[PDB]
Amino acid sequence: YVCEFLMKVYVDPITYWKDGYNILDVIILIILTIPYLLRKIKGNHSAYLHFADGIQSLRILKLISYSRGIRTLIIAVGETVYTVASVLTLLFLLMFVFAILGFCLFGVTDRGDLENWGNLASAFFTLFSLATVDGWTDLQEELDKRKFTVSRAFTILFILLASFIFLNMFVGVMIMHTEDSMKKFERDLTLERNLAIMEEKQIILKRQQEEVNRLMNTQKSG
């Protein structure tokens, strides 16, 4: 790996600063080399071990950095990064809105419901659970006993907004982004095949014209 970074320490980093896969692999090399340099021979102040299998998995990711077919699939799906970032930001804003709403509805009163709509991190995790399908039943049994009858209505409104909107907008966005990405690629491939076909036909026509002209010239000179 040190030898590979020595190959990638060339002037080619003028192309390893704007590209796709290339910045990914050199940054992977950096975040590989630094930690085990401070882990295998550590001698330092640090807490504990949580990045041995992680570092080896980054090395496995560097293994999978090959296979140009996966590179073409990555190219075909890499224009959805902005879209998934935008939907992730929308999810984060909605999560923040209902985070402050849940804290002010069940955590501010301080008559129970602690570490569910109480502390901010646990509140965020419970909202992420409730925006999915998991854990809604037990949370519902937990919240209805805190003298809040409208809490059930608020939670079912939150589910029917967040879960459906997030899941179905995501699947539709990716379905048609992938469809429109592959449509132009297939059309370009068929255009290239058609261009090759007409070039071959033109070559055949030129060869036939040359043969006819040669036969006519030999008939005239004969």
Binding site: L49, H50, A52, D53, G54, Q56, S57, I60, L61, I64, G69, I70, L73, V77, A121, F125, T126, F128, S129, T132, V133, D134, G135, D138, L139, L167, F170, V171, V173, M174, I175, H177, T178, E179, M182, E186
Partner: protein, 281 residues
């Protein structure tokens, strides 16, 4: 005779009706016998043994069926299409008679696997409809198109599972007496099982609350890692597979559209050439 007899018995509708009737009679009878093998109904005991020996008779019918299959190309049929899979399944279904005649099945019998295999062949050799056939062709051509997505799925599974083995290493390897999900993160195969569970996204809230019994180390790396893994893997792979199958349907219909388009322009050209022929006469 021989191959001519196979052609005649496949041509005759009475033989086909008899064999399909026997097939669905066997499938209906098969589940009944496992319900009761006791003295609850003494009068129904010999007739239930008669139903089981009718199943043995259907195995004899499979024997004479492969006898009819010998009337076919014989040695050439040993390497063929899914018909050779049907032949192998019928051999595996005639095996239990041999393993109860000489094997004394007080052991790992595995008759259940061969039974469900012959039911699988029976549920597929049921004169499948064309509506089933077109969707089966679409499914097999789609999984033919599924060339690199499953590889990326298994490699993301591999890297994230082998990463998450030693991330909640303080969970299974914890001396807390009261815990019930400790075996989830214990072994590497158990890690594969639990990250597949996270991929299916069932009781992730209950799982995380059961990992909340770990001493809370300010949740700075581990909880965000598992949450990001489950959400990213689930949504990305679900979206990518529904997108690929939608694109498969799109290109199937596009090929259909171009094909009746070509058929229509061919028909129009044929009509024009028919008018030309009529004028030339």
């Amino acid at each position: 005779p021989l191959s001519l007899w196979a052609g005649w018995v496949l041509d005759s509708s009475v033989f086909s009706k008899f064999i399909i009737s026997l097939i669905f009679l066997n499938t209906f009878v098969l589940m009944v016998e496992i319900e009761l093998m006791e003295s609850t109904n003494t009068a129904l005991w010999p007739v239930k043994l008669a139903l089981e020996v009718a199943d043995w008779f259907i195995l004899l019918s499979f024997i004479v069926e492969i006898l009819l299959m010998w009337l076919a190309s014989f040695s050439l049929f040993w390497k063929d299409a899914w018909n050779v899979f049907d032949f192998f399944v019928t051999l595996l279904s005639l095996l239990p008679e041999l393993v109860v005649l000489l094997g004394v099945p007080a052991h790992s019998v595995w008759l259940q696997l061969l039974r469900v295999c012959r039911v699988l062949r029976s549920l597929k050799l049921f004169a499948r409809f064309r509506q089933i056939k077109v969707i089966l062709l679409a499914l097999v051509r789609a999984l033919k198109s599924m060339t690199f997505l499953l590889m990326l799925l298994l490699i993301f599974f591999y890297i994230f599972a082998v990463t998450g083995v030693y991330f909640f290493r303080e969970y299974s390897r914890s001396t807390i007496e009261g815990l019930e999900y400790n075996m989830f993160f214990s072994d590497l195969l158990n890690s594969l099982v639990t990250v597949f569970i996270l991929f299916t996204l069932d009781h992730w809230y209950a799982v995380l609350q059961d990992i909340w019994k770990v001493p809370e180390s300010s949740r700075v790396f581990s909880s965000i890692y598992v949450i990001l893994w489950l959400l990213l893997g689930s949504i990305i792979f679900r979206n990518i597979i529904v997108a690929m199958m939608v694109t498969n349907f799109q290109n199937i219909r596009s090929e259909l559209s171009e094909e009746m388009s070509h058929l229509e322009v061919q028909y129009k050209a044929d009509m024009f050439k028919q008018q030309i022929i009529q004028r030339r006469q």
